[PDB]
């Protein structure tokens, strides 16, 4: 429904830096690099502020389930813990929080992320008669 498209349209309007990363870019590049990279991206945006931080994917990062019996999971479970934190430190200042895209609402946690840590949590209508009327009207 072009949920991400909206994030593109506002990003362009600002005429400022945009730092856009994927979930895969947060996790390692030399093994164990991955949590360090999480700190780096957010701070880099503050140096060149106004700026936007966008995360396309958190499909395996915001999931509650993790092991450590699986070596791979260890970096990922850290990326989630650091992301909760960033939201705390950001508050009572002029730093805007993380803007994110996901497929569903059941991948994210229901008791670690919740509203008034992200002002607006927006669902896009699955039924929407009018939205479709607008798609046909471009053709008109």
């Amino acid at each position: 429904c072009g949920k991400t498209m909206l994030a593109k349209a506002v990003a362009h309007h600002t005429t400022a830096a945009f730092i856009r990363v994927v979930g895969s870019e947060f996790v390692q590049k030399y093994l164990g690099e991955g949590p360090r990279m999480v700190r780096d991206v957010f701070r880099l945006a503050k140096e060149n502020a106004p700026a936007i931080i966008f995360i396309d994917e958190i499909d395996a990062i915001a999931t509650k389930r993790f092991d450590a019996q699986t070596g791979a999971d260890r970096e990922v479970q850290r990326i989630l813990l650091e992301l909760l934190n960033q939201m705390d430190g950001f508050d009572q200042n002029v730093n805007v929080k993380v803007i994110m895209a996901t497929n569903r609402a059941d991948t994210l946690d229901p008791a670690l992320l919740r509203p008034g840590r992200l002002d607006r949590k927006i669902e896009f209508p699955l039924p929407d008669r009018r939205q479709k009327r607008l798609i046909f009207s471009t053709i008109t």
Partner: protein, 152 residues
């Protein structure tokens, strides 16, 4: 104006001197040299400078280095640590027990546990056996553990 001319001129020669790094004096040796552990490069044993010595620099202290000769310059209390990067985002803490909580019981219960061992740890040691171990804040996100930690 003489002074300004001089500052630039001295600045130019003083600076040209190649290299100037940082190390840490992990330890000192009986050869009245100190071991420097250069942080992304080879370790180097150097003589004490006339600016600072073994008496002046205690172990596991961060230091400045001058030249390609890795001679001592100044003492640095700072060290590159992820803690430093975590502070930048943290900024300035906020909140109090009252805002978060609301009830007079909540504020009393956190307050006694935490505050008093920082004020006097010697007392606590005496009080039981040894010094009080970790403490655990737990609750629903309707007390908010990291936020409380900033209020404390």
């Amino acid at each position: 104006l003489n002074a300004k001319v001089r500052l630039l001129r001295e600045e130019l020669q003083l600076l040209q001197e190649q290299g100037s790094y940082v190390g840490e004096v992990v330890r000192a040796m009986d050869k009245k040299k100190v071991l420097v552990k250069v942080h992304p490069e080879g370790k180097f044993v150097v003589d004490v400078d006339k600016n600072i010595d073994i008496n002046d620099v205690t172990p596991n202290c961060r230091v400045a280095l001058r030249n390609d000769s890795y001679t001592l310059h100044k003492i640095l209390p700072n060290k590159v640590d992820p803690l430093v990067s975590l502070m930048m985002v943290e900024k300035v803490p906020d909140s109090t027990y009252e805002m978060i909580g609301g009830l007079d019981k909540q504020i009393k219960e956190i307050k006694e546990v935490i505050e008093l061992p920082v004020k006097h740890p010697e007392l606590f040691e005496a009080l039981g056996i040894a010094q009080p171990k970790g403490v655990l804040l737990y609750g629903p996100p309707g007390t908010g553990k990291t936020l409380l930690a900033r209020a404390v």
